[PDB]
Amino acid sequence: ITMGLEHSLSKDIISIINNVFQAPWGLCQSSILCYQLACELLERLAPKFCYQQLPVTLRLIYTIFQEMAKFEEPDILFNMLNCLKILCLHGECLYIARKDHPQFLAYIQDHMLIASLWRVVKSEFSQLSSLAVPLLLHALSLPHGADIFWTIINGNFNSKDWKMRFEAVEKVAVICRFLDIHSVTKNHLLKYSLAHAFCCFLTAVEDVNPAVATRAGLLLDTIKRPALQGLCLCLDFQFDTVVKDRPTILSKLLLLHFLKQDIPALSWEFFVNRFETLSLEAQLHKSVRSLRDSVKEDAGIDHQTVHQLITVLMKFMAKDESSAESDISSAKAFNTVKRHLYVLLGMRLSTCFNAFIAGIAQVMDYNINLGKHLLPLVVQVLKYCKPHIRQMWLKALLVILYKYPYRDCDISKILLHLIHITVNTLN
Amino acid sequence: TFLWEVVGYVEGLFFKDLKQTMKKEQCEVKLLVTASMPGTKTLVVHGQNECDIPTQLPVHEDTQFEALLKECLEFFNIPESQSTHYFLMDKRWNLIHYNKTYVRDIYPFRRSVSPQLNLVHMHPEKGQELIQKQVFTRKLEEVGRVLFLISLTQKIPTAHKQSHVSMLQEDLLRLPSFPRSAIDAEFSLFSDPQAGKELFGLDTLQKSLWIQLLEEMFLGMPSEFPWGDEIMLFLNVFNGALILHPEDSALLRQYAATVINTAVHFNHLFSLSGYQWILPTMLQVYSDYESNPQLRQAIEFACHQFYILHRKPFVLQLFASVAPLLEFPDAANNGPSKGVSAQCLFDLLQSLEGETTDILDILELVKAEKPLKSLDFCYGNEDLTFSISEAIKLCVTVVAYAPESFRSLQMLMVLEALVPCYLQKLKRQTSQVETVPAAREEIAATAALATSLQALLYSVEVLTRPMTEELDERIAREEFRRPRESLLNICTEFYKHCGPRLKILQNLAGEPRVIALELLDVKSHMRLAEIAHSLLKLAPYDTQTMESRGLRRYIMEMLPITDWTAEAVRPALILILKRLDRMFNKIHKMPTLRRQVE
Amino acid sequence: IFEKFPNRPQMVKISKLPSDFTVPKIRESFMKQFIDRIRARNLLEKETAVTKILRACTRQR
């Protein structure tokens, strides 16, 4: 029968449970059994400061946080976390705290909730973490919380003691491996905080102590591929929105492709989303901070970011096969990559052409199937509209014909013009 | 730390060429794990002045540092108050040594030279910090070596992989340190605050790397391998990892998917005799951490996939492995609460009954085809969803094939643990919803269990034959009396539980027309009387069987509830009264036999 | 030629049964091979478990 989770009788029961909670013990299994029985009543219930006008639920959360830092056995801790979930979501105390309790919500987030949850996230008793993670994700879905978490990971990761770096990479690994995909796609600064956590996680792969480097590399292995896809989608969203931080992110993403390549860290749908994003960043003519401490407009600079993306693209097709024709998926994607690779690259004072010559030689050296598949479009654009780039030019035309059946008509004739260019651009 | 990708980017390597060219440098074990170079056999201790001399001492395969600590305590006469204030070290490499690790992993056999050892006076805290940092460094090189071996056997040519992994397994067999050094941790350093989560994180990484290496080693080899006793030794690492870090979620997902992969690969061994080496440790870990739902969810998913792979032999081997750890409150074997409970086994079987949803995503680390189907056509695509009555049917069939064997006695112990708990939880669920189809399924379930009990009593006539420097005699009387008292315990708990409950259920069924459905027939009662009579035929000669709870529960709880208003059931009673007649006639006519009776 | 016919799997059946109850499907080779033969969280039960598994590993060679 329904009895009401908010009624005056039920809050009187809650007042009984508070003054049980405020009386400590000072045998131990007695306290485990007493708190679990009280917790079962809590399950059944819901499916000096000026504290005398405060509702008792947040004061219960207060004394839970107060007695959180006393014991070291995960059984009572586990039970407390269960109670915490029952009150945060089924009890809706944080929901009414964010509805009409901002100051005390600032009090709750600023010193109790984030630091205690950062204390209980561990890599040896991984059921406290399995309880702790949706509560911490509920905490970071609110204002004032991302700054505290930002300063926590800044003081943990940028420390001069390497054990703090060690403990920071294990904790950010435990947050990353207990995440979901669609549960994050509504809040902006949740995605920003998880993106900064993931980029510090990727930044720790190359740290100066070898132990943190090998730990981040081996602990990157133990992450389930949907969580890594969701992290890559958050990082791609933060690349889409934020402008001034595109230098670092690509470096991190290259490290990602270099380490975890089974997940599509780079794919053709990724490149067509970035193609339309550079189109909206180019053909159209915030408030968050910069994550550059995580590591530390229409003619040239956006085009230089485009060039940088071209260099990453040439590295991608040199590295992997990426057979977009083996499936019926990504046919329009790869097709869009070749079309717009023709259109925006086809105006002899750019930085893209020499890097394309610098890349396509290693492309033709390492790839064969897509290499033959893309050759004729490379030679159509060679002179469509200089010493060392001449050296790579002749290296390019050296590896055009080494294993490749080029032999067509009206196209091979231009090779006659090419040996004419052996007495034209030299003369 | 860069060779882990260099060997991924260098082709043209095998197992033998590096061993043939390494032996020239006398440092074979310092690069890869599987280098079978033996170590030193003697060692020298150095002094500090002309009062003492460097002394040579032998090294066996089980020598450790603590014996050398006792040696220097006994020889130099060091007081034990200053035991932790002193340490031992080498002068040349300047290395402090962990106390509880073996010497043989550290000192390979130098060519006619022995490394030095000095008893040094040091502060204890600097020494324990030095020990912690040097073993942090040291097992980081082991972790590096394991990385080299995992990256080594990934991109090998597809012709040469079989001989490579087979001779790899063969040189793992020749190693005397495997798998000691592959599974043991450092336990006098895990409790300190200055080696708290560092040694844990690297130990978690090292165990996960060892699981990856073994999983690659098991795969590749042919499915028709002559697997002797060696599989258990290899499986022991898989047990040991779950012993050390059971609540760590990474080791759990990897352990579950690796055992699923090696149960799909060696399908022949894991259809006959393979599950007897991995299930004791899994049941112990499932039984202990009952307040930890993630470990519980991972083990129920792994056992559900075990059943989906192999249907009936897995359930048989499961009952053969949960049996030597079960303790029940009997008055013959006083079972303590320090092992697998009866409830733990029964809720594990109840999770095997229903479906288990996936929360931890263990399936995508399984290299075989998905979804898993039955690997043998004897059970096929028939709808053999696991019930609990069919477990009783299997136990009946294996005790019925040879009731004087050992599997019969063992499965009788299994049955006397299981069927009171099944009848109990059946009583809870029929006293939980109180509905007329619940009453119908309770009557049908009691009838089917009764059918299986008639099938159990119809095929135990070899136990009705009576019996024929004393330790084998006590063994013979034991193996005489265990299945008999097991049958009496089962039948009297069944009768005194369900008979009045059959009348109660018949009252609350909604149809009181069917009453007194006659659970046991006359031949079952006469069979129980002949077993009890054969038990009582030994009673005055050994004094421990009068107080046995099966016999006493039959005498005080089953004889008065048996109806005798008809005379068809009566020859059971005349045999029981005849046996009690002759026992008390013999106890009366012999006073020496009366002088030793309780 | 020797496998075109439909496969025939050997079973186990016992005739001393009341024949209202079906004997389940178990192969006879497996049958004869089979019939032939809070407190845990602390650091002491694991170490004792490790040394018990090491002696039992060494004992069965």
Swiss-Prot record, chain A:
Subcellular location(s) per record: Cell membrane
Recorded superkingdom: Eukaryota
Disulfide-linked positions: none
Subunit composition and interactions: NALCN complex consists of NALCN and auxiliary subunits, UNC79, UNC80 and NACL1. These auxiliary subunits are essential for the NALCN channel function. UNC80 bridges NALCN to UNC79.
Entry's family note: Belongs to the unc-79 family.
Role noted for this protein: Auxiliary subunit of the NALCN sodium channel complex, a voltage-gated ion channel responsible for the resting Na(+) permeability that controls neuronal excitability. Activated by neuropeptides substance P, neurotensin, and extracellular calcium that regulates neuronal excitability by controlling the sizes of NALCN-dependent sodium-leak current.
Protein name, per record: Protein unc-79 homolog
Provenance organism: Homo sapiens (Human)
Section covered of the full-length record: 819 to 1432 of 2635
UniProtKB/Swiss-Prot annotation, chain B:
Superkingdom: Eukaryota
Post-translation changes: Phosphorylated on tyrosine residues.
Transmembrane segments: 313-333, 443-463
Compartments, as annotated in UniProt: Cell membrane
Tissue: Moderately expressed in fetal brain, spinal cord, skeletal muscle, thymus, spleen, fetal liver, small intestine, colon, kidney and uterus. Highly expressed in adrenal gland, prostate and testis, as well as in brain and cerebellum.
Functional description taken from the UniProt entry: Auxiliary subunit of the NALCN sodium channel complex, a voltage-gated ion channel responsible for the resting Na(+) permeability that controls neuronal excitability. Activated by neuropeptides substance P, neurotensin, and extracellular Ca(2+) that regulates neuronal excitability by controlling the sizes of NALCN-dependent sodium-leak current. UNC80 is essential for NALCN sensitivity to extracellular Ca(2+).
Quaternary structure, from the entry: NALCN complex consists of NALCN and auxiliary subunits, UNC79, UNC80 and NACL1. These auxiliary subunits are essential for the NALCN complex function. Interacts (via N-terminus half) with NALCN; this interaction facilitates NALCN surface localization. Interacts with UNC79. UNC80 bridges NALCN to UNC79.
Family, as annotated: Belongs to the unc-80 family.
Disease connection: Hypotonia, infantile, with psychomotor retardation and characteristic facies 2: An autosomal recessive, neurodegenerative disease characterized by severe truncal hypotonia since birth or early infancy, progressive peripheral spasticity, and profound psychomotor developmental delay. Some patients may have seizures.
UniProt protein name: Protein unc-80 homolog
Shown stretch of the complete protein: 1956 to 2607 of 3258
Curated annotation (Swiss-Prot), chain C:
Locations listed in the record: Cell membrane
Superkingdom in the source lineage: Eukaryota
Post-translational modification, as annotated: Phosphorylated on tyrosine residues.
Quaternary structure (record): Found in a complex with NALCN, UNC79, UNC80 and NACL1; these auxiliary subunits are indispensable for the function of NALCN channel. Interacts with UNC80; required for the NALCN activation/inhibition by GPCRs in neurons. Found in a complex with NALCN, UNC79 and UNC80; UNC80 bridges NALCN to UNC79. Interacts with CHRM3.
Domain remark text: Contains 24 transmembrane helices (TM) that form four homologous functional repeats connected by intracellular linkers. Each of the four internal repeats contains five hydrophobic transmembrane segments (S1, S2, S3, S5, S6) and one positively charged transmembrane segment (S4). S4 segments represent the voltage-sensor. S4 transmembrane segments lack some of the charged residues (K and R) found at every third position in the S4s of the NaV, CaV, and KV channels.
Function description: Voltage-gated ion channel responsible for the resting Na(+) permeability that controls neuronal excitability. NALCN channel functions as a multi-protein complex, which consists at least of NALCN, NALF1, UNC79 and UNC80. NALCN is the voltage-sensing, pore-forming subunit of the NALCN channel complex. NALCN channel complex is constitutively active and conducts monovalent cations but is blocked by physiological concentrations of extracellular divalent cations.
Family named by the database record: Belongs to the NALCN family.
UniProt name for this protein: Sodium leak channel NALCN
From-to range in the entire protein, with total length: 633 to 737 of 1738
